[PDB]
Amino acid sequence: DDLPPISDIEAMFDHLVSRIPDIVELVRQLNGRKLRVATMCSGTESPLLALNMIAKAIKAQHGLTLAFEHVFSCEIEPFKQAYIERNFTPPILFRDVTELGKKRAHTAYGSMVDVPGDVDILIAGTSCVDYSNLNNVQQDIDANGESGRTFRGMLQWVKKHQPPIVILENVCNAPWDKVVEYFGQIDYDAQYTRLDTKEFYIPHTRTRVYLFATPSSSESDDLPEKWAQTVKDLRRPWSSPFEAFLLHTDDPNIHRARLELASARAGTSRKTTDWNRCESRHQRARQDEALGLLRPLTSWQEAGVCKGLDWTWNDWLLAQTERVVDLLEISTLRMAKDGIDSGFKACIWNVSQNVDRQTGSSKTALAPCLTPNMIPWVTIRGGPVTGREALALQGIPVRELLLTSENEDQLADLAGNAMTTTVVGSAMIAALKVACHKITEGANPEKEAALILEKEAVDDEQVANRIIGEDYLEHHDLDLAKVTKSNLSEILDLACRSSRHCQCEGQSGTAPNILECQECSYRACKSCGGRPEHVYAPCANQRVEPAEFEKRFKGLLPMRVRIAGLTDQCLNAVRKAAEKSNKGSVNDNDWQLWSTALLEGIHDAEFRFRYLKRQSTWTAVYEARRAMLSLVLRNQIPEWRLTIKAPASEPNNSQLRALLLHPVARLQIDIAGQDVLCGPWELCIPSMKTIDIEITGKGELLPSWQASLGLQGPFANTTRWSEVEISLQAEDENTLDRKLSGTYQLLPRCGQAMSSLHKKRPDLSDDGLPQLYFFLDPTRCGESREDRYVFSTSTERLDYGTERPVIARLDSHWREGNEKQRKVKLDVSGAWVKCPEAHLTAIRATFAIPSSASAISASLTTEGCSHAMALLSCRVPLDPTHSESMWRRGAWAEIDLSHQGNTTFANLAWITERLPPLDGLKNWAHIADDVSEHVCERCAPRPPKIHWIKRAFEDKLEAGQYEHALKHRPSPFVVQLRLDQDIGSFRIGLNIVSLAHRALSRLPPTTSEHKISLSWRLTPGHVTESPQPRRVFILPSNKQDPENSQPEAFKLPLRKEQLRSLWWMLEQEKATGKTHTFVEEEISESLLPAVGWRAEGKAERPVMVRGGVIADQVGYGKTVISIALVAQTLSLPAPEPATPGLIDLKATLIVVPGHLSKQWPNEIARFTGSMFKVIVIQGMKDLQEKTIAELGKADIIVMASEIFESDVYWSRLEYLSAQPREWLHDTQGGRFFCDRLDAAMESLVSQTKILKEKGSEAAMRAMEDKKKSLVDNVGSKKEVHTKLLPNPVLHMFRFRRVIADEFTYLQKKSLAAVLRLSSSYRWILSGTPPVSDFAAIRSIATFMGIHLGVEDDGEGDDQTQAEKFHAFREVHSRAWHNRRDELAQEFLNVFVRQNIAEIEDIPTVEHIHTFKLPASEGAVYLELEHHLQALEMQARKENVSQGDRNARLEEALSDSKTAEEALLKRCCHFTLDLSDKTQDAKSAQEACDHITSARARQLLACQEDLSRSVNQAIALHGWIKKKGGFSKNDDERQPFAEWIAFSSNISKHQGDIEAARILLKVIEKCGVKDGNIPPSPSDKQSPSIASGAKMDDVKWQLREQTHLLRKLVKELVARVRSLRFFEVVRKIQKGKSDAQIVLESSECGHKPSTNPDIEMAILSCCGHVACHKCMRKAAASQRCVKSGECQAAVRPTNIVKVSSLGVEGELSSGRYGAKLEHLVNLIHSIPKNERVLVFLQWEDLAGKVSEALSAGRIPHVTLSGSAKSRANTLDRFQSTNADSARVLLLKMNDASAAGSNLTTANHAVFLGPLFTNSLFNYRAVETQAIGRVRRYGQQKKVHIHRLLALDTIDMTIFNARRTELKEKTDWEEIPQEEYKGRGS
DNA sequence: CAGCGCAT
DNA sequence: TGCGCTGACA
Ligand SMILES: Nc1ncnc2c1ncn2[C@@H]1O[C@H](COP(=O)(O)OP(=O)(O)NP(=O)(O)O)[C@@H](O)[C@H]1O
Ligand SMILES: Nc1ncnc2c1ncn2[C@@H]1O[C@H](CSCC[C@H](N)C(=O)O)[C@@H](O)[C@H]1O
Ligand SMILES: [Mg+2]
Ligand SMILES: [Zn+2]
């Protein structure tokens, strides 16, 4: 609107200050003293930002300089004060605005400091949560509330300290006049005025009011009026849409916000919420507005299952609450009715409000009043405005502002209520201009000028002396013209072959399974695949990483061009020549304005290169100071497309911004050559002529966009011609290019704006041209009457700021209609011309490279953090014109990285490319030993120490100092550049030693003497392609090593494999010669992305660890090897160390699971009979009864591993350490317990060092005072404050060896303790070693002691967050992860040995028991399965009593955490009559008829309840009627009286129809019959009003009763829907005759009685029976078989084929489930000798299985109990004595199936197929379970059974896993016979 | 933290 | 024209 488009906050502020010059006269009044400003309530501290930008504009314009002195501010928020103290850091920060009235006010930290009152301007805004808050329905009144809390707090201070200016702000509807009375009551005068934001440069529309009051004046000059006039003087009304203020969808901010905002309501998605009371308003609105009950934008069924379009932020809508979504759809319809098309017209809605409160939409280019609770929906981007965009719609710049720990709710709150920085800037500047005099002077000017110059000088010296490596240079001369030769057809091929095939990829990478439509040419992923479904035949194309295509395309094209031209008169030649042809004669004014503005890009202003882009088809954009040129590189006819930039300051409605809007003078490449630029440069003159054009219709008449959309008003049944024939006259056609007179067909599927994509029918008058389309395209800002149809050759979404090439537009009056032979007028523009003879032609650079890496390695003496070792420096000639801003005329301007410095680097990339890559630095070079760690500060700041106060965490001030001292780290890869007199230069260098100190930082320190040794290297030309493979680790073998050939004193020999392994273990423990066995390092990266470099600095230290992980396949003798190792090593004298701290023993403790405590000593005694004493501990008491003098004798001690959780252990250790009584008392969690246990271990080792002398006391006594003195701190508390000896703790000794066993089952609480046990050699035994990923190897290393790397987030598939923040986090590349993998593989090669056992083979016959489920349980499980199918495999659990269908559910979904798990677990058990304990074997038919009878009872119960509620409501209504409340006039749509009109009309009732008939019968069986509104109820029961409270109260009670009615109606519909299905399945099972009876079809039309035998399938959730062909055809289109009367939402999934559930085999054995019943007969069939061991997986079924076996004549033994009992039961089950429990029930995935050496049994049962995800993990645990019986001492043949269901998921996952195994590695299948045992 | 609600 | 509040919910 007649104003220049302003979008940059800096520009609008310097404009603001440029409009008034009466402010520079302030800095003379201040006389050199800085303003002293204070702010009472300030969220984003918008006043401070405004003042800082005003100061910047002052210094930039007038040369002057005024500073500021923030005295204080206050915010009782928890995090807004954190944000303040991290950005501005004021000296004092109170937390209140009413305490400051006192002399000793409180501080945000609690210091209770005194208040300073030397302010110069106090700017504060009272809060709004009570000042009528028109969102809020409650309101506080008359100074009882806000004006007594905050305002009366502010008044006392402002009176007690008299600041010369105070400016207030609050909402419009406020008691302001009373505020003026309060202020003028004492001193002030206080005029107040209101003003919006949309009047100050910003489109935001939010409105507020301001106030200003200077202390009393003598003569009362009436300042506030002059203030108001000065403010309202300066204004400028929003010359730009909001889209200019939004971020582009590509930058990492938008990705980082979508990843967080996409999953807000998360493993199991939360419960289906309730909105019924608003659902009523939605239905009423859809009815009143004549809209149709569709859901266009998002075809949602439930809350979380929906499918937005392929341009919508789908991962947002999936997360939305359902009311929000339905509101989106009602807004779309209510808008699409008016004619405009949301989704193509930019405008912000508000959604967090209600349908009723949606006035003011259909209004574009203005945001609404942002509030912290709204959710705005842009409707054109298709998603919400994120945090930083909600900031930018205020004045606040997200730049230069550090937002750490800020989420979308927090950004919403901050930028929601903060006053617009431009409004506040203007009001404050007018204050400071009108009351300039009142502020005093400084009286010290020259000292201030000197201070300013001094600080500027030291800063300009710093960045200059940053670089310290100019010693070495070579000065290789540089040839900028580094073009190459290429066939230019293969490169266009490779350009088409590597380009964005979905919005998912986005300029970086590749996503698979692209679907390319046929006849529309629109590619898109399979995910987010088109809901506007196209033809979509799969795409056939290979994929080349964009990295390769860019690497070649750079080298192919020049780095600069310039259009030769000499076209001053060529334009007039072209004009006359074109006039000779037929084209619109151009005016004089248009020609002049166009030519004179074009003649500056043709001037010899050379084009540079920048940001070759990938959006689609790889445009490569060049740029000059005034023009822009960009080779398009289309997949057909590549062209160049020059364009000219309109000037900076020029209003929007200007002729030049119309003439230079579209490109001019394109050039089409000569294909099939070697030169990338050959064409003749045709031109585009501003010619605009109009032509008549006849439009006609053909083909049939498809439904219009309205009718297809679902409208029901006068739009229902409206059509449009399916094909259009365009007829242009001969000459008027042959004047222009791209003839148009063909015919165009419609594509209702291939969407566009208003679904009007007309693809031209192929014609052979031209083949060299691309395909042409004819559609609509709205303006996106202007009203929709002006939009027009258009002819173009492109069709896609366009981002703000880029237009599309069109051939011609059509009159703004023609629409797809019904009439034919309509004659309209087309208009052509920019009619091109023949080709001029102008063309483009391309065109002492020098760069320093380090000669060799030796020169550098000396310069970094020590503390290389202070300086930078220079790497490159390029001196390049640049003309003094068009030298960019970054080029500074002296003193080496510094570029900032990961900040505003990204266009700076993209500007000079034309020099960056074409530079030889640095070589000879690939190797790791520098080495310097740093014995101690001594982490360099400013490089690795110490974290705040977390301390315990509970019986605070992350001390505030320390957190602030941390998050500040992390942004001032040395920042490797510093890049500075400076422009000389002619030739500029820049110096890229990195702080090598900073990298090295950061790498050293990450090693955790030990009490050792091994010294680190740093390094460094720089590798060029790295690019990110994709994580294409996944590494698979390899565990070596122990075969090749020789053998020790015997251990002495064994009763039985070891085999040769075991001998080789024992010898390897001996040697590995010894390690003769070598002094360290492994090196561990943490390579730290720092990428300079734009140049191809990435740096790496490492820090490695050797570590001597003896012992390693032996993980041998099941059956091998790991126990035997360990006992042999102990027996062998026994004789040796002692190890190498000295162990002075704590006590050393000779015993070798073995940590085993709870139930192996009898298996281990038995094996030890069996092999070496009484060779050495072996003391066992199982219970805590067995530990406490021992003494150290007794442990000394013990050669080997066996320890159960649950004492570490016995929790008496932790108490006794709390005593030996002398800690508080509950220092180590923590719940199951082993977090925060590691630090506490570490401190306890330090204190314990000191105490034991003391106790070695027997001087027991006086130390535990000395530490109590230490702790109770340390506690005394000013922080947050709960209040003002607060030899031999029995029972030794095992953490105070040191053994010769510690051999864990089954280590991968050591849970958190006991892992965190076994990790601390101290010994010389530490061996680990396992059978299933986790080697899948890097975390599973790190978890092994931590047992060993190695570090082996730190934990990053990306390596996969709150406390310390200060280092996990996108501003303080690392960006570790892919090569980093590959090096970490190589390191894990090296550790595995060194310390891990797996090898195959070659004892002998075990027969291993296999069986399988598969059966069908009954009809009743079949139906139940099918209902559950279809539920989860329609919910997309996610567990969702869900007044009026629940039905039976919802009762079979909410029981399966109770504890299930995964969809597949609720199915594995359902098929097992099916108990009928869930309410009563009564039970007996009921036949199948009995079960089904019981189900159906219970459902009939439920239905009639709901019926009677509904009628009861109607009677109560009609009594209420008669009450109100007689008591004269509706007045029978001035209607207000009485709710109940309307619901009774709705319900009567049967055709209006959505949902099933039979339920509607039930409702009508029940309602007419009452006082209402054909809209009666009776006077009395049908029971004559009393209305239950309390005491006749009020009339409106009764109206409210009625308004609630009616919603209760409506809810009950929905519930009744569901009831009938479920009853029908169970009844029909009962009939299908009932018998053949009744099956024929019920097989009366859905009126589908055909059935076995009339037509031949046709498999006709029953549908679930409606109960309708129809033919499978009709069933599929109907369900695919999302509509039931009954056309428009079933009204149920149908998925293709829930289609149950008849006769797919069984009755045949009389499988009546539904007692305790039909699975567990088939188990018991099996177990009886097993002979009486053999033992059995069942393998269930889900613990929650142990009860049901032990209730089935028990009371099923079979006794068993479960392995549950305590650490003492499990060993005994396992021992008796292994034992030789007869008549134990025959079957033993094992839990899989539990420490009970760890390794048991039980071979008494010979066959498993293994009921439910294993579910676990990983195939390798599946295989490992299944072979472990099998091998539990297939062992060495077997002496028998083994069987394996399986109980799988034919219907369920069991057979599915069984087939998947078994086939995938049979294809993969050997895993030799088991013979698989069939069972005919029958032993009893 | 999702519903619910008409005025200065 | 709206810088929510208040019962339920994990
Ligand atoms: N040299 C040997 N002479 C006699 N028996 C042996 C010998 N080596 C192993 N065994 C027996 O072979 C069986 C193997 O069990 P064991 O080696 O203790 O299993 P594990 O490897 O510790 N557990 P797991 O593999 O997970 O099932 C035991 O009964 C051993 O006593
Ligand atoms: N004692 C107090 N009374 C009112 N608000 C307080 C307060 N202490 C802190 N606040 C916070 O201060 C804010 C009030 S409004 C602050 C924003 C203001 N428009 C500006 O930009 O300066 C709220 O976030 C509120 O939570
Ligand atoms: Mg074992
Ligand atoms: Zn298509």
Ligand SMILES: [Zn+2]
């Ligand atoms: Zn995609």
Ligand SMILES: [Zn+2]
């Ligand atoms: Zn350092």
Ligand SMILES: [Zn+2]
């Ligand atoms: Zn149906």
Ligand SMILES: [Zn+2]
């Ligand atoms: Zn049918």
